Coordinates of C-alpha atoms (C1' of nucleotides) in Angstrom, one line a residue:
Chain A
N1 CA 30.4 8.4 1.1
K2 CA 28.9 7.7 -2.3
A3 CA 28.6 4.5 -4.3
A4 CA 28.0 3.4 -7.9
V5 CA 25.6 0.6 -8.7
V6 CA 25.2 -0.8 -12.2
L7 CA 22.1 -3.0 -12.5
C8 CA 22.5 -5.6 -15.4
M9 CA 19.2 -7.2 -16.5
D10 CA 18.2 -9.9 -19.0
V11 CA 15.2 -9.0 -21.1
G12 CA 15.5 -11.9 -23.5
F13 CA 12.8 -14.3 -24.7
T14 CA 13.7 -16.9 -22.1
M15 CA 13.0 -14.5 -19.3
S16 CA 9.5 -14.0 -20.6
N17 CA 8.7 -17.8 -20.4
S18 CA 6.1 -17.8 -17.7
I19 CA 5.7 -21.4 -16.4
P20 CA 2.0 -22.0 -15.4
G21 CA 1.6 -21.4 -11.7
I22 CA 4.8 -19.5 -11.4
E23 CA 5.6 -15.9 -12.1
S24 CA 7.9 -15.2 -15.0
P25 CA 11.6 -14.4 -14.1
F26 CA 11.2 -11.0 -15.8
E27 CA 8.5 -9.9 -13.4
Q28 CA 10.4 -11.0 -10.4
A29 CA 13.6 -9.2 -11.6
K30 CA 11.4 -6.1 -12.3
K31 CA 10.0 -6.2 -8.7
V32 CA 13.5 -6.6 -7.2
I33 CA 14.9 -3.7 -9.2
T34 CA 11.9 -1.6 -8.4
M35 CA 12.3 -2.3 -4.7
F36 CA 16.0 -1.4 -4.9
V37 CA 15.3 1.9 -6.7
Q38 CA 12.5 2.8 -4.3
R39 CA 14.8 2.3 -1.4
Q40 CA 17.6 4.4 -3.0
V41 CA 15.3 7.2 -4.1
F42 CA 12.9 7.6 -1.1
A43 CA 15.8 7.3 1.3
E44 CA 17.5 10.4 -0.3
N45 CA 20.7 8.5 -0.6
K46 CA 23.5 10.1 -2.6
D47 CA 24.1 6.9 -4.6
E48 CA 24.5 6.8 -8.4
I49 CA 22.6 4.1 -10.3
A50 CA 22.9 3.0 -13.9
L51 CA 20.9 0.4 -15.8
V52 CA 22.2 -1.9 -18.5
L53 CA 19.8 -4.3 -20.4
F54 CA 21.2 -7.2 -22.4
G55 CA 18.9 -9.1 -24.8
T56 CA 17.2 -6.1 -26.4
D57 CA 16.6 -5.9 -30.1
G58 CA 18.7 -2.8 -30.5
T59 CA 22.3 -1.9 -29.4
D60 CA 23.1 1.2 -27.5
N61 CA 26.4 0.4 -25.8
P62 CA 29.8 2.1 -26.2
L63 CA 31.5 -1.2 -27.2
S64 CA 29.2 -1.6 -30.3
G65 CA 32.2 -1.4 -32.7
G66 CA 31.4 -4.3 -35.0
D67 CA 29.4 -7.5 -34.5
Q68 CA 30.5 -7.9 -30.9
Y69 CA 28.7 -6.9 -27.7
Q70 CA 25.4 -6.7 -29.6
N71 CA 21.9 -6.6 -28.1
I72 CA 23.1 -4.6 -25.1
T73 CA 21.8 -1.1 -24.2
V74 CA 22.8 1.4 -21.5
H75 CA 19.3 2.4 -20.6
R76 CA 20.4 4.9 -18.0
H77 CA 23.8 6.5 -17.4
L78 CA 25.6 7.0 -14.0
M79 CA 23.4 9.8 -12.6
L80 CA 21.3 10.2 -9.5
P81 CA 18.1 8.1 -9.6
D82 CA 14.8 9.8 -10.0
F83 CA 11.1 9.0 -10.7
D84 CA 12.0 8.7 -14.4
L85 CA 13.9 5.5 -13.7
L86 CA 11.0 4.1 -11.8
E87 CA 8.6 5.0 -14.5
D88 CA 10.8 3.4 -17.1
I89 CA 11.1 0.2 -15.0
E90 CA 7.3 0.1 -14.4
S91 CA 5.9 0.8 -17.9
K92 CA 8.3 1.5 -20.8
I93 CA 10.6 -1.5 -20.5
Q94 CA 9.4 -4.6 -22.4
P95 CA 11.1 -8.0 -22.9
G96 CA 13.3 -8.2 -26.0
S97 CA 13.0 -10.7 -28.9
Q98 CA 16.7 -11.6 -28.8
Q99 CA 18.9 -13.7 -26.6
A100 CA 22.3 -12.5 -25.4
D101 CA 24.8 -13.8 -22.9
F102 CA 25.6 -12.1 -19.6
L103 CA 29.4 -12.0 -20.1
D104 CA 29.4 -9.2 -22.7
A105 CA 26.8 -7.4 -20.6
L106 CA 29.1 -7.7 -17.6
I107 CA 32.0 -6.4 -19.7
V108 CA 29.8 -3.4 -20.8
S109 CA 28.9 -2.8 -17.1
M110 CA 32.6 -2.7 -16.1
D111 CA 33.3 -0.4 -19.0
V112 CA 30.5 1.9 -17.9
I113 CA 31.8 1.9 -14.3
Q114 CA 35.4 2.7 -15.5
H115 CA 34.4 5.5 -17.9
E116 CA 31.7 7.2 -15.9
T117 CA 33.6 7.1 -12.6
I118 CA 36.4 9.3 -14.0
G119 CA 35.3 12.8 -12.7
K120 CA 33.8 11.6 -9.5
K121 CA 35.2 9.9 -6.3
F122 CA 33.3 6.8 -5.2
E123 CA 34.2 4.7 -2.2
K124 CA 32.5 1.5 -3.4
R125 CA 31.6 0.1 -6.8
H126 CA 28.9 -2.6 -7.2
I127 CA 27.4 -4.5 -10.1
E128 CA 24.2 -6.6 -9.8
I129 CA 23.2 -9.0 -12.6
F130 CA 19.7 -10.5 -13.0
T131 CA 19.7 -13.3 -15.5
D132 CA 18.3 -16.7 -16.2
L133 CA 21.5 -18.2 -17.6
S134 CA 19.7 -19.7 -20.6
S135 CA 21.8 -18.3 -23.4
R136 CA 24.9 -19.4 -25.2
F137 CA 28.1 -17.7 -24.1
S138 CA 31.9 -17.8 -24.6
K139 CA 34.6 -18.1 -21.9
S140 CA 37.3 -16.4 -24.0
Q141 CA 37.0 -13.2 -21.8
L142 CA 36.5 -14.7 -18.3
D143 CA 40.1 -14.3 -17.1
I144 CA 40.3 -10.7 -18.3
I145 CA 36.9 -10.1 -16.6
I146 CA 38.2 -11.5 -13.3
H147 CA 41.5 -9.5 -13.5
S148 CA 39.6 -6.2 -14.2
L149 CA 37.1 -6.8 -11.4
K150 CA 40.0 -7.5 -8.9
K151 CA 42.0 -4.5 -10.1
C152 CA 39.1 -2.0 -10.2
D153 CA 37.7 -3.1 -6.8
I154 CA 34.2 -3.9 -8.1
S155 CA 31.8 -6.1 -6.1
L156 CA 29.5 -8.6 -7.8
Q157 CA 26.1 -10.1 -7.0
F158 CA 24.0 -12.6 -9.0
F159 CA 20.2 -13.0 -8.9
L160 CA 18.7 -16.1 -10.6
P161 CA 15.1 -17.5 -10.8
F162 CA 16.3 -20.6 -8.8
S163 CA 18.2 -20.7 -5.6
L164 CA 21.3 -22.9 -5.0
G165 CA 3.1 -27.8 -5.0
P166 CA 2.0 -24.1 -4.7
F167 CA 4.7 -21.5 -5.1
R168 CA 4.6 -18.1 -3.4
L169 CA 6.9 -15.1 -3.9
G170 CA 8.9 -14.6 -0.7
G171 CA 6.9 -17.3 1.0
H172 CA 9.8 -18.9 2.9
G173 CA 9.7 -21.9 0.6
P174 CA 11.1 -23.3 -2.7
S175 CA 10.9 -20.8 -5.5
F176 CA 11.9 -22.9 -8.5
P177 CA 11.6 -26.7 -8.1
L178 CA 14.7 -28.6 -9.1
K179 CA 12.8 -30.4 -11.9
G180 CA 13.2 -28.8 -15.4
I181 CA 16.5 -26.9 -15.1
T182 CA 18.1 -26.8 -18.5
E183 CA 21.7 -27.9 -19.2
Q184 CA 22.7 -24.4 -20.2
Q185 CA 21.3 -23.2 -16.9
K186 CA 23.6 -25.7 -15.1
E187 CA 26.6 -24.5 -17.0
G188 CA 25.8 -20.9 -16.3
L189 CA 25.4 -21.6 -12.6
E190 CA 28.7 -23.5 -12.5
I191 CA 30.4 -20.5 -14.3
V192 CA 28.9 -18.1 -11.8
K193 CA 30.0 -20.2 -8.9
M194 CA 33.6 -20.3 -10.3
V195 CA 33.6 -16.5 -10.8
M196 CA 32.3 -15.9 -7.2
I197 CA 34.9 -18.3 -5.7
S198 CA 37.6 -16.6 -7.7
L199 CA 36.5 -13.2 -6.5
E200 CA 35.5 -13.4 -2.8
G201 CA 36.6 -17.0 -2.0
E202 CA 34.1 -19.3 -0.3
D203 CA 32.2 -16.3 1.0
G204 CA 31.1 -15.6 -2.5
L205 CA 28.7 -18.5 -2.6
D206 CA 26.3 -16.7 -0.2
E207 CA 26.0 -13.8 -2.6
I208 CA 24.1 -15.8 -5.2
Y209 CA 20.5 -15.0 -4.2
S210 CA 17.1 -15.5 -5.9
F211 CA 14.4 -13.0 -6.8
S212 CA 11.9 -14.4 -4.3
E213 CA 14.5 -14.8 -1.6
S214 CA 16.0 -11.4 -2.3
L215 CA 12.5 -9.8 -2.0
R216 CA 12.6 -10.5 1.7
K217 CA 16.3 -10.4 2.6
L218 CA 17.5 -6.8 2.2
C219 CA 20.6 -8.3 0.5
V220 CA 20.7 -5.9 -2.5
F221 CA 21.8 -3.1 -0.1
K222 CA 24.3 -5.2 1.8
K223 CA 27.3 -3.8 -0.2
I224 CA 26.3 -0.2 -0.2
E225 CA 25.0 0.3 3.4
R226 CA 27.0 2.9 5.4
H227 CA 28.7 2.1 8.7
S228 CA 27.5 3.7 11.9
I229 CA 29.6 6.3 13.7
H230 CA 31.7 5.3 16.7
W231 CA 31.4 6.6 20.2
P232 CA 34.9 6.7 21.9
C233 CA 35.3 6.4 25.6
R234 CA 37.5 4.7 28.3
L235 CA 36.2 1.6 30.1
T236 CA 37.3 2.1 33.8
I237 CA 37.8 -0.9 36.2
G238 CA 39.4 1.2 39.0
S239 CA 41.1 4.6 39.4
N240 CA 44.4 3.8 37.6
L241 CA 43.2 1.3 34.9
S242 CA 41.5 2.5 31.7
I243 CA 41.0 0.8 28.3
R244 CA 40.2 2.9 25.3
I245 CA 37.0 1.6 23.7
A246 CA 34.6 2.4 20.8
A247 CA 30.9 1.8 21.1
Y248 CA 28.5 1.3 18.2
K249 CA 24.7 1.0 18.1
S250 CA 24.3 -2.7 17.2
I251 CA 20.5 -2.6 17.3
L252 CA 18.3 0.4 17.0
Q253 CA 14.7 0.8 15.9
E254 CA 14.5 2.3 12.4
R255 CA 12.0 5.0 11.8
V256 CA 11.0 7.1 8.7
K257 CA 13.5 9.9 8.1
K258 CA 11.0 11.9 6.0
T259 CA 8.1 13.7 7.7
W260 CA 4.7 15.0 6.4
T261 CA 4.2 18.7 5.8
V262 CA 0.7 20.2 6.2
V263 CA -0.4 22.0 3.1
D264 CA -3.6 23.8 2.0
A265 CA -6.1 21.8 0.0
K266 CA -6.8 24.5 -2.6
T267 CA -3.1 25.3 -3.2
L268 CA -0.4 22.7 -2.3
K269 CA 1.9 25.1 -0.5
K270 CA 3.1 25.1 3.1
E271 CA 3.7 28.8 3.3
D272 CA -0.1 29.6 3.2
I273 CA -0.7 27.8 6.5
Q274 CA 0.6 29.1 9.8
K275 CA 0.6 27.3 13.1
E276 CA 0.8 29.3 16.4
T277 CA 0.4 28.5 20.1
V278 CA -1.2 30.9 22.5
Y279 CA -1.6 31.0 26.3
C280 CA -4.6 32.3 28.2
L281 CA -5.7 32.6 31.8
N282 CA -8.6 30.9 33.6
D283 CA -11.0 33.8 33.0
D284 CA -14.0 34.4 30.8
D285 CA -12.1 37.2 29.0
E286 CA -9.5 34.8 27.6
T287 CA -6.8 37.2 28.6
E288 CA -3.6 36.7 26.5
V289 CA -0.2 36.3 28.2
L290 CA 3.1 36.6 26.4
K291 CA 5.6 33.7 26.4
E292 CA 8.1 35.8 28.4
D293 CA 5.5 36.1 31.2
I294 CA 5.3 32.3 31.7
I295 CA 7.0 30.4 34.6
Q296 CA 7.6 26.7 34.9
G297 CA 6.0 24.9 37.8
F298 CA 5.3 21.4 39.2
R299 CA 2.5 19.8 41.1
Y300 CA 3.0 18.8 44.8
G301 CA -0.2 17.0 45.7
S302 CA -2.9 19.7 45.2
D303 CA -0.3 22.5 45.8
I304 CA 1.5 24.3 42.9
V305 CA 5.2 24.9 43.6
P306 CA 6.7 27.4 41.1
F307 CA 10.0 26.2 39.7
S308 CA 11.7 28.4 37.1
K309 CA 13.9 26.9 34.4
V310 CA 17.0 28.8 35.6
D311 CA 16.5 27.5 39.1
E312 CA 16.0 23.9 37.9
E313 CA 19.1 24.1 35.7
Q314 CA 21.1 25.5 38.7
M315 CA 19.8 22.8 41.1
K316 CA 19.6 19.8 38.7
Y317 CA 21.7 16.8 39.2
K318 CA 25.2 17.3 37.8
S319 CA 27.7 14.7 36.8
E320 CA 30.9 14.3 34.8
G321 CA 29.7 13.3 31.3
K322 CA 31.2 10.8 28.9
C323 CA 31.9 8.1 31.4
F324 CA 32.0 4.3 31.0
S325 CA 32.9 3.0 34.5
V326 CA 32.5 -0.6 35.9
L327 CA 30.5 -0.5 39.1
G328 CA 31.2 -4.2 39.7
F329 CA 31.0 -7.8 38.4
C330 CA 28.1 -10.2 39.0
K331 CA 27.1 -13.7 38.0
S332 CA 25.3 -13.7 34.7
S333 CA 22.5 -15.7 36.2
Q334 CA 21.6 -12.7 38.4
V335 CA 20.8 -10.6 35.3
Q336 CA 17.6 -11.5 33.5
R337 CA 16.6 -10.6 30.0
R338 CA 13.1 -9.6 31.1
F339 CA 14.7 -6.7 33.1
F340 CA 16.5 -5.2 30.1
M341 CA 15.6 -1.5 29.5
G342 CA 16.3 1.2 27.0
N343 CA 15.8 1.2 23.2
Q344 CA 19.3 0.3 22.0
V345 CA 22.0 -2.3 22.3
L346 CA 25.7 -1.2 22.4
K347 CA 28.6 -3.2 20.9
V348 CA 31.9 -2.1 22.5
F349 CA 35.2 -2.9 20.8
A350 CA 38.7 -1.7 21.4
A351 CA 40.0 1.6 20.1
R352 CA 40.4 2.3 16.4
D353 CA 44.1 1.1 15.9
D354 CA 46.0 0.0 19.0
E355 CA 47.2 -3.5 20.1
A356 CA 47.3 -2.7 23.8
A357 CA 43.6 -1.8 24.2
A358 CA 42.6 -4.8 22.0
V359 CA 44.6 -7.1 24.3
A360 CA 43.2 -5.6 27.4
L361 CA 39.6 -5.9 26.1
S362 CA 40.2 -9.4 25.0
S363 CA 41.5 -10.4 28.4
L364 CA 38.5 -8.8 30.1
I365 CA 36.1 -10.5 27.8
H366 CA 37.7 -13.9 28.1
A367 CA 37.8 -13.6 31.9
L368 CA 34.1 -12.8 32.0
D369 CA 33.2 -15.6 29.6
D370 CA 35.3 -18.2 31.5
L371 CA 34.1 -17.1 34.9
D372 CA 30.4 -16.7 33.8
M373 CA 30.2 -13.1 34.9
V374 CA 28.9 -9.7 33.6
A375 CA 29.9 -6.2 34.4
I376 CA 27.4 -3.8 36.0
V377 CA 28.6 -0.4 34.6
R378 CA 27.6 3.2 34.6
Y379 CA 26.9 4.8 31.2
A380 CA 26.6 8.4 30.3
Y381 CA 26.7 9.7 26.7
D382 CA 27.7 13.2 27.7
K383 CA 27.1 15.8 30.4
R384 CA 23.5 16.4 29.4
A385 CA 22.7 12.6 29.1
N386 CA 21.2 11.2 32.2
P387 CA 23.5 8.5 33.7
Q388 CA 22.2 5.0 33.6
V389 CA 23.1 1.6 35.0
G390 CA 23.6 -1.2 32.5
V391 CA 25.0 -4.7 32.1
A392 CA 27.9 -5.5 29.7
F393 CA 28.4 -9.2 28.8
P394 CA 31.0 -10.9 26.6
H395 CA 30.2 -11.7 23.0
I396 CA 32.8 -14.0 21.4
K397 CA 32.6 -15.1 17.7
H398 CA 34.9 -17.0 15.4
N399 CA 35.9 -13.8 13.7
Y400 CA 35.4 -11.0 16.3
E401 CA 34.8 -10.5 20.0
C402 CA 33.2 -7.5 21.9
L403 CA 31.1 -6.5 24.9
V404 CA 27.4 -6.2 24.5
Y405 CA 25.9 -3.5 26.7
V406 CA 22.2 -3.2 27.5
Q407 CA 20.6 -0.8 30.0
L408 CA 19.2 -2.0 33.3
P409 CA 16.3 -0.8 35.4
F410 CA 16.2 1.4 38.5
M411 CA 14.2 0.6 41.7
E412 CA 11.4 2.9 40.7
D413 CA 11.3 1.6 37.1
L414 CA 10.0 -1.8 38.4
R415 CA 6.3 -2.4 38.7
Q416 CA 5.2 -4.7 41.6
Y417 CA 2.1 -6.5 40.5
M418 CA 0.3 -9.6 41.9
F419 CA -1.1 -12.3 39.6
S420 CA -3.1 -15.3 40.6
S421 CA -1.3 -18.6 40.3
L422 CA -2.4 -21.0 37.5
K423 CA -0.7 -24.3 38.5
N424 CA -2.7 -24.6 41.7
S425 CA -6.2 -23.6 40.4
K426 CA -8.8 -26.3 40.5
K427 CA -11.1 -24.5 38.0
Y428 CA -8.5 -23.7 35.3
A429 CA -6.5 -27.0 35.5
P430 CA -6.3 -28.7 32.1
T431 CA -7.0 -32.4 31.7
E432 CA -4.8 -35.1 30.3
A433 CA -6.5 -35.0 26.9
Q434 CA -6.1 -31.2 26.7
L435 CA -2.4 -31.4 27.5
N436 CA -2.0 -34.1 24.8
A437 CA -3.8 -31.9 22.3
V438 CA -1.6 -28.9 23.2
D439 CA 1.5 -31.1 22.9
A440 CA 0.4 -32.3 19.4
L441 CA -0.3 -28.7 18.3
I442 CA 3.2 -27.6 19.5
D443 CA 4.9 -30.6 17.7
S444 CA 3.0 -29.9 14.5
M445 CA 3.9 -26.2 14.5
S446 CA 7.7 -26.3 15.0
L447 CA 9.5 -23.5 13.2
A448 CA 12.9 -25.2 13.8
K449 CA 14.1 -28.4 12.2
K450 CA 16.8 -30.8 13.2
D451 CA 19.5 -31.3 10.5
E452 CA 20.7 -34.6 9.2
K453 CA 23.0 -36.2 11.8
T454 CA 24.8 -33.0 12.7
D455 CA 22.9 -31.6 15.7
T456 CA 22.3 -28.1 14.2
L457 CA 18.9 -26.5 14.4
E458 CA 17.7 -24.8 11.2
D459 CA 15.2 -21.9 11.4
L460 CA 12.2 -22.3 9.0
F461 CA 10.8 -18.8 9.7
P462 CA 13.8 -16.4 10.5
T463 CA 11.8 -13.3 11.2
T464 CA 15.0 -11.5 12.2
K465 CA 16.0 -11.4 8.5
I466 CA 12.7 -10.0 7.2
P467 CA 12.6 -6.3 6.3
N468 CA 10.1 -4.1 7.9
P469 CA 7.0 -4.1 5.6
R470 CA 6.0 -0.6 6.5
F471 CA 8.8 1.0 4.6
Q472 CA 8.1 -1.0 1.5
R473 CA 4.3 -0.3 1.7
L474 CA 5.1 3.5 2.1
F475 CA 7.4 3.5 -0.9
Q476 CA 5.0 1.6 -3.1
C477 CA 2.1 3.9 -2.1
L478 CA 4.2 7.0 -2.7
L479 CA 5.3 5.8 -6.1
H480 CA 1.8 4.9 -7.1
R481 CA 0.5 8.3 -6.0
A482 CA 3.4 10.1 -7.9
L483 CA 2.8 8.1 -11.1
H484 CA -1.1 7.9 -10.7
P485 CA -2.2 11.1 -9.1
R486 CA -5.9 10.4 -9.8
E487 CA -6.2 6.9 -8.4
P488 CA -6.6 5.5 -4.9
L489 CA -3.8 3.7 -3.1
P490 CA -3.2 0.1 -4.2
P491 CA -3.6 -3.0 -2.0
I492 CA -0.7 -4.5 -0.1
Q493 CA 1.6 -6.5 -2.4
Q494 CA 1.2 -10.3 -2.1
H495 CA 4.8 -11.0 -1.5
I496 CA 4.7 -8.8 1.6
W497 CA 2.0 -11.1 3.0
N498 CA 3.9 -14.2 1.9
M499 CA 7.0 -13.1 3.7
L500 CA 5.0 -12.0 6.8
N501 CA 3.4 -15.5 6.9
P502 CA 4.9 -18.8 8.0
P503 CA 5.5 -21.7 5.6
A504 CA 2.4 -23.4 4.3
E505 CA 3.8 -26.7 5.6
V506 CA 3.4 -25.6 9.2
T507 CA -0.3 -24.7 8.6
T508 CA -0.9 -28.0 6.7
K509 CA 0.5 -30.1 9.5
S510 CA -1.3 -28.0 12.2
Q511 CA -4.8 -28.3 10.6
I512 CA -5.6 -31.5 12.5
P513 CA -4.3 -30.6 16.0
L514 CA -6.0 -27.2 15.8
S515 CA -9.3 -28.9 15.2
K516 CA -8.6 -31.3 18.0
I517 CA -7.9 -28.4 20.4
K518 CA -11.1 -26.6 19.2
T519 CA -13.2 -29.7 19.9
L520 CA -11.5 -30.3 23.3
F521 CA -11.4 -26.6 24.5
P522 CA -14.8 -24.9 24.8
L523 CA -14.4 -21.2 24.1
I524 CA -17.4 -18.8 24.2
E525 CA -17.3 -15.0 24.1
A526 CA -18.8 -13.1 27.0
Chain B
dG1 C1' -53.1 16.3 37.0
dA2 C1' -49.4 19.4 38.1
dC3 C1' -45.8 20.5 41.3
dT4 C1' -42.2 19.4 44.8
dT5 C1' -38.9 16.4 47.4
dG6 C1' -36.0 12.4 47.9
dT7 C1' -33.6 8.2 46.2
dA8 C1' -31.4 5.1 42.7
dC9 C1' -29.3 4.1 38.3
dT10 C1' -26.1 5.1 34.4
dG11 C1' -23.6 6.7 30.2
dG12 C1' -20.3 10.5 29.0
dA13 C1' -16.4 13.3 30.3
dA14 C1' -12.3 14.0 33.1
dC15 C1' -8.2 12.0 34.5
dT16 C1' -4.4 9.1 33.9
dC17 C1' -1.2 6.2 31.4
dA18 C1' 1.4 4.9 27.3
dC19 C1' 3.0 5.4 22.6
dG20 C1' 4.0 7.7 18.2
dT21 C1' 5.2 11.9 15.4
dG22 C1' 7.6 16.2 14.7
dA23 C1' 10.5 20.4 16.0
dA24 C1' 14.3 22.6 18.6
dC25 C1' 18.6 23.2 21.3
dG26 C1' 23.2 21.9 22.7
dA27 C1' 27.3 18.6 23.1
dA28 C1' 30.7 16.2 20.9
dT29 C1' 33.1 15.0 16.8
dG30 C1' 34.8 15.4 12.3
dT31 C1' 35.8 18.1 8.1
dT32 C1' 36.7 22.3 5.1
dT33 C1' 38.2 27.1 4.3
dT34 C1' 40.9 31.0 5.3
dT35 C1' 44.8 33.7 7.3
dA36 C1' 49.0 34.9 10.3
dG37 C1' 54.0 33.2 11.0

DNA sequence: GACTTGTACTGGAACTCACGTGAACGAATGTTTTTAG
């Protein structure tokens, strides 16, 4: 499953206008595109990327017939990204001295998508445009653009310097204050809104991001990310009732797919280094014993009991693999989140294409939701997988419904520890002033706000939408080392810290209560 | 002052626990190529 992405970028004079105290839009767009290319390259994704720049002095586009579609250059064709693209983005791409509209650039991007994707099969086609919307443009080709986009199945995404005192990139705050926007910018925003509505309906509004917002949203990869595989099984409620189901891994910790290979310092080759493991007895002679002369064993309280691998396999617990059986139903209040185990969460839907299984699963989910119940079930990936006991609870949304499954603990997996009570201690009991100070601190540091007469909490620091900074740090360090072999690693990028920190308003409001708490609470290190 | 014996103190190593990283095998599924009917 491959994809084609055409990145359209403005390099005009307006993009270079760096307002004091705010980074220029050109730099923010460069950072966003660099992040996208880093993710695409270092992830070893088989995705094709092309780059079109509109606003350059020259013209290097196929549509350069006469005096139309000028100041547009196809910097890179539709071929796999490499370090060359990153190097060009970083150093040898400078702002142009001419201003060009984004409509002819978008037409050029569609033409590139159509022509290049003639000898290759691509499941998805995406076009991303980074522009300021501060250039004159003509609407004569809007209808044909929309028709071509709809016919060719091409997705669209817009990135602008402004979203729909101090300013920080990815700082969970206002990037571009709404004081100074030019009229042409308003017209361009309205046109972009019209195009997005005409393409994806009302859902298209959410696809108009901002550089600062996009730097901490992972939105650029939304339309190219691959779906997880499905695990098919049969949910069993008895011995004669079965519902075909498919389970996906809704949540799973993401690790680094690429490992580190040990190489020799003098020569950077892994074939000159060999790693071997040896076994020796408990004798001064260090007698060597072959692997075939080794037997598995276990400790039995100061006594060693030999236990060969074949014997263990013969006598190990055996069960019928690939089972999803409902042990029973219990009140949801009897299952507590603190007891959740495992490292994954499963989302169970009906089978691929069948109305009967969907109806049965919907009936079960609705019954559980109405009765306030969850299903204690037995889960086993396959014959080898160790069977586990888990809880499946309904999850109903306006657009879809499913069963969320999370593993549950065993009796020996629970640790019984005793902790001294704090509410009945005469030495650690806080005073009224201390409680008031803590209450003031909590009030002054609320990450959720109440909306205007609608009773809908709004999250000010949605950490769930923040990408993992480790991957970005690793990618930036790898790129710096590749392009600068003879320099040390650079410091952590500022926007990473900005996105990893809360809004400055919270700290500003919390300054006073924190000082009050410090004065009231005496803390001294031992 | 030098040796011996007995008692008390104490920081380092052994052990355990827990987590992260990397490598290998087999199960289950899906997909592609080749060959007999």
